Design an enzyme around this catalytic site. Structure first.
Site, mmCIF file in Angstrom:
data_model
loop_
_atom_site.group_PDB
_atom_site.id
_atom_site.type_symbol
_atom_site.label_atom_id
_atom_site.label_comp_id
_atom_site.label_asym_id
_atom_site.label_seq_id
_atom_site.Cartn_x
_atom_site.Cartn_y
_atom_site.Cartn_z
ATOM 1 N N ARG A 150 50.816 39.213 26.648
ATOM 2 C CA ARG A 150 51.814 38.487 25.864
ATOM 3 C C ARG A 150 51.183 37.355 25.075
ATOM 4 O O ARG A 150 50.182 36.773 25.509
ATOM 5 C CB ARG A 150 52.912 37.940 26.792
ATOM 6 C CG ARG A 150 53.592 39.022 27.617
ATOM 7 C CD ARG A 150 54.823 38.537 28.347
ATOM 8 N NE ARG A 150 55.673 39.683 28.677
ATOM 9 C CZ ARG A 150 56.975 39.620 28.940
ATOM 10 N NH1 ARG A 150 57.620 38.456 28.919
ATOM 11 N NH2 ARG A 150 57.640 40.734 29.223
ATOM 12 N N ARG B 218 53.855 28.726 24.062
ATOM 13 C CA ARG B 218 55.213 28.325 24.410
ATOM 14 C C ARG B 218 55.763 27.551 23.226
ATOM 15 O O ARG B 218 55.183 26.540 22.824
ATOM 16 C CB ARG B 218 55.184 27.469 25.679
ATOM 17 C CG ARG B 218 56.543 26.948 26.144
ATOM 18 C CD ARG B 218 56.367 25.991 27.348
ATOM 19 N NE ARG B 218 55.951 26.668 28.573
ATOM 20 C CZ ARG B 218 55.224 26.119 29.550
ATOM 21 N NH1 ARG B 218 54.792 24.861 29.473
ATOM 22 N NH2 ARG B 218 54.920 26.845 30.625
ATOM 23 N N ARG C 286 33.118 35.653 41.392
ATOM 24 C CA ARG C 286 32.694 34.407 40.770
ATOM 25 C C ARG C 286 32.780 33.346 41.854
ATOM 26 O O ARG C 286 33.795 33.246 42.539
ATOM 27 C CB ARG C 286 33.624 34.045 39.608
ATOM 28 C CG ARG C 286 33.355 34.800 38.312
ATOM 29 C CD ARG C 286 32.629 33.911 37.307
ATOM 30 N NE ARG C 286 31.255 34.306 37.091
ATOM 31 C CZ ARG C 286 30.359 33.630 36.375
ATOM 32 N NH1 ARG C 286 30.650 32.469 35.800
ATOM 33 N NH2 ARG C 286 29.145 34.122 36.258
ATOM 34 N N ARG D 234 36.061 22.305 34.583
ATOM 35 C CA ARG D 234 37.077 21.271 34.676
ATOM 36 C C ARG D 234 36.672 20.157 35.615
ATOM 37 O O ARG D 234 35.725 20.291 36.397
ATOM 38 C CB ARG D 234 38.417 21.866 35.109
ATOM 39 C CG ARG D 234 38.368 22.599 36.389
ATOM 40 C CD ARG D 234 39.681 23.293 36.633
ATOM 41 N NE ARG D 234 39.658 23.881 37.961
ATOM 42 C CZ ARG D 234 40.729 24.330 38.598
ATOM 43 N NH1 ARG D 234 41.931 24.266 38.011
ATOM 44 N NH2 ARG D 234 40.582 24.847 39.821
ATOM 45 N N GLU E 289 33.731 20.804 38.483
ATOM 46 C CA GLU E 289 33.698 22.192 38.928
ATOM 47 C C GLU E 289 32.817 23.083 38.027
ATOM 48 O O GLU E 289 32.943 23.065 36.797
ATOM 49 C CB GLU E 289 35.141 22.697 39.019
ATOM 50 C CG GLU E 289 35.333 24.172 39.284
ATOM 51 C CD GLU E 289 36.803 24.562 39.107
ATOM 52 O OE1 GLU E 289 37.685 23.852 39.647
ATOM 53 O OE2 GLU E 289 37.079 25.548 38.394
ATOM 54 N N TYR F 207 42.784 38.312 44.231
ATOM 55 C CA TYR F 207 43.140 36.891 44.117
ATOM 56 C C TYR F 207 44.597 36.766 44.527
ATOM 57 O O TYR F 207 45.435 37.490 43.995
ATOM 58 C CB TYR F 207 42.947 36.319 42.703
ATOM 59 C CG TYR F 207 43.373 34.859 42.681
ATOM 60 C CD1 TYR F 207 42.485 33.853 43.065
ATOM 61 C CD2 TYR F 207 44.680 34.494 42.338
ATOM 62 C CE1 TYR F 207 42.878 32.520 43.094
ATOM 63 C CE2 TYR F 207 45.081 33.160 42.361
ATOM 64 C CZ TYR F 207 44.170 32.187 42.740
ATOM 65 O OH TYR F 207 44.547 30.880 42.765
ATOM 66 N N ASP G 224 47.797 33.842 45.437
ATOM 67 C CA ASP G 224 48.329 32.507 45.564
ATOM 68 C C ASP G 224 48.798 32.276 46.997
ATOM 69 O O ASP G 224 49.009 33.232 47.754
ATOM 70 C CB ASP G 224 49.504 32.296 44.612
ATOM 71 C CG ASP G 224 49.069 32.188 43.168
ATOM 72 O OD1 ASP G 224 48.046 31.529 42.888
ATOM 73 O OD2 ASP G 224 49.773 32.766 42.322
#
Ligand SMILES: Cc1cc2nc3c(=O)[nH]c(=O)nc-3n(C[C@H](O)[C@H](O)[C@H](O)COP(=O)(O)OP(=O)(O)OC[C@H]3O[C@@H](n4cnc5c(N)ncnc54)[C@H](O)[C@@H]3O)c2cc1C
Length: 383
Positions: free
Chosen positions: A173, A177, A249, A279, A300, A348, A350
């Site tokens: 997509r 926003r 990674r 970051r 990081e 991965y 959450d």
């Protein structure tokens, strides 16, 4: 029958499965090779600054699953928290994800939502009818300047791959926003535990039928002492990496302490390859209800996961998924073991998804007991 359960790992997967079974009278033994509970979600207070540090990187709780939300509120006081991310690139600071402020700042404009939709449309590269690559998908969607500012440098650094080497599937997509909302996550439930994730997991682990042993590696011989084993360690490691390591990674965190306010937000992205870290996280900003004079920060860095590196992001390309299939063809012939979690299933996940899967895994095991049914090696599809 009170079953004897061995659980390898005291992160969300092992703790949540542990608690569910313990509450049904089973004798749960949870081991972890680390000197503390919590797995990758572990947090601890820094002694000098008393900052709650997200030890293995920023962990932001978010979910649309009201069952999981209710679950975590039983084990922690969840503080309203809506993560907002900034990104430094082209000598400027922007809000992420790309939104109306980002566009307006980037192009020095004053666009309404509808004017921005039209700016984005005319910026998009309409030369490739069917984008096959991630670079061309991005180019089709947002054009060159935005792709090169926010997507190219970050993919190279974060994945160690040119976006030209990745499929168009990665970006389904238009990643824009068209309003001024700058919440990073769209989930209905977002929050941060007041006393941290470790205290949250300690409360999950706080049951008489759970015995926790830290600083203790799993030993294959042990399996026979138990009715079932739940394994949340690396699937490849279970098999001695006999076919080679599944590609990850890895992250390195350079820790430093600042007197005052280093960056003025929780997370600052650095989207250029001209900057070696991806970051910088300033941990104290994850607890706005606390005040701290000293500030613990992480630079990081991302790299290819080598020997004795902690695995972070699974690569899962065609080579890795093929290598995986070799491990699964062993795994699916095992008895009295279920592989779970980010490491056990090479995905991965959450925190909220992890908890959702752990609750289901336990339900599946418990069901297998009542009507005497054979427990699956995986309770989710891994392919
Ligand atoms: C850098 C990073 C950032 C993240 N940020 C977010 C976020 O912002 N929001 C979010 O929702 N999720 C985030 N996640 C995901 C979150 O960390 C996972 O959902 C969570 O770690 C899943 O927990 P788990 O118990 O399945 O695995 P883990 O937390 O990895 O637990 C595995 C445990 O098993 C132990 N273990 C492994 N092998 C053995 C062995 N052989 N013997 C004994 N013990 C062993 C390990 O020591 C470890 O404690 C992030 C993940 C990473 C890596």
């Amino acid at each position: 029958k009170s079953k004897k359960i061995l659980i390898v790992g005291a992160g969300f997967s092992g703790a949540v499965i542990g608690r569910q079974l313990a509450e049904k009278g089973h004798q749960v033994h949870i081991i972890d090779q680390r000197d503390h509970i919590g797995g990758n979600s572990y947090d601890a207070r820094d002694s000098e600054t008393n900052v709650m540090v997200h030890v293995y990187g920023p962990h932001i709780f978010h979910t649309d699953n009201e069952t999981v939300w209710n679950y975590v509120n039983k084990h922690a006081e969840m503080m309203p928290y809506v993560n907002r991310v900034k990104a430094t690139v082209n000598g400027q600071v922007f809000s992420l994800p790309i939104n109306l402020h980002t566009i307006n700042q980037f192009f020095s404009k004053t666009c309404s939502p509808d004017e921005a939709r039209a700016l984005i449309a005319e910026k998009g590269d309409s030369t490739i009818a069917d984008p096959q690559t991630f670079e061309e998908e991005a180019l089709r969607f947002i054009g060159k300047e935005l792709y090169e500012a926010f997507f190219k440098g970050y993919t190279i650094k974060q994945w160690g791959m040119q976006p030209s080497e990745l499929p168009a599937s990665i970006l389904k997509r238009l990643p824009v926003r068209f309003n001024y909302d700058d919440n990073y996550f769209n989930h209905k439930f977002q929050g941060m535990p007041k006393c941290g994730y470790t205290q949250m997991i300690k409360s999950i682990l706080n049951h008489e039928n759970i015995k926790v042993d830290l600083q203790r590696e799993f030993i294959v011989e042990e399996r026979t002492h138990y009715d079932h084993v739940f394994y949340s360690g690396p699937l490849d490691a279970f098999y001695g990496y006999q076919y080679g390591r599944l590609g990850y990674r890895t992250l390195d965190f350079k820790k430093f302490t600042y007197q005052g306010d280093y960056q003025g937000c929780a997370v600052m992205n650095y989207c250029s390859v001209d900057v070696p870290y991806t970051r910088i996280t300033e941990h104290k900003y994850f607890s706005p209800w606390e005040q701290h004079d000293g500030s613990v920060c992480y630079k990081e860095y991302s790299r290819a996961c080598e020997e004795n590196d902690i695995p972070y992001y699974p690569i899962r390309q065609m080579g890795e998924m093929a290598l995986l299939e070799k491990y699964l063809s062993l795994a699916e012939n095992e008895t009295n073991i279920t592989f779970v979690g980010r490491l056990g299933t090479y995905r991965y996940l959450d925190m909220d998804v992890t908890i959702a899967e752990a609750l289901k895994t336990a339900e599946v095991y418990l069901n297998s007991l009542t009507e005497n049914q054979p427990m699956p090696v995986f309770t989710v599809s891994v392919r």
